[PDB]
């Protein structure tokens, strides 16, 4: 898509009471915030099957 360059994606989970610290002298692609984490019955599947009512 035009580029010979790349971005590498990483993740960090921070539990309550912990602290995030980000330190960069450059090349950093910074987070804009956080995604809420939940536990439950959710999951993911690969399928081409049409969804139907």
């Amino acid at each position: 898509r035009g580029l010979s360059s790349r971005i590498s994606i990483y993740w960090t989970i921070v539990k309550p009471g912990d602290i995030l610290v980000i330190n960069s002298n450059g090349n950093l692609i910074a987070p804009r915030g956080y995604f809420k984490m939940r536990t439950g019955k959710s999951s993911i599947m690969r399928s081409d099957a049409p969804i139907g009512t």
Binding site: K41, S42, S43, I44, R46
Partner: protein, 171 residues
Amino acid sequence: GIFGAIAGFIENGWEGMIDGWYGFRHQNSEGTGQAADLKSTQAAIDQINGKLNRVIEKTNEKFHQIEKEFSEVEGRIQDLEKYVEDTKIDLWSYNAELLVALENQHTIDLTDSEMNKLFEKTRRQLRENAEDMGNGCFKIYHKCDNACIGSIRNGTYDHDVYRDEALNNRF
């Protein structure tokens, strides 16, 4: 089966009996008749259902699991994920095959059992007034009209009544 009644000393089944699993056919002075035995039919059906309900019961709910297909060759970890799933499937496949074999063998044996039990119950009722013809038929040595046959079927037959007559005709 294991009691030798069904496909046993009882030659074959009656396609003509549509109202029960087990019953009586009789021939006496008045004519021929056929009637289903509902108690033993029920015994069989109940057991078979009990079992059917054991097996058909609620399945297990699972949500997020390991991935079972792969688009890239990764080596070790994929080898392991693949091996685990394959192991699981082989074991459950075994459980199912065996469940069916055992259960079926037992169903065959228990239905045979019910038949034989009805036969035995009846023979015991009749006491000295009849003989086992070996084909699953009794020979009744006194005069038995439709009421009397009925009394045999609903378990109220009083042998002492006909004992003299029958004893006489047997010997």
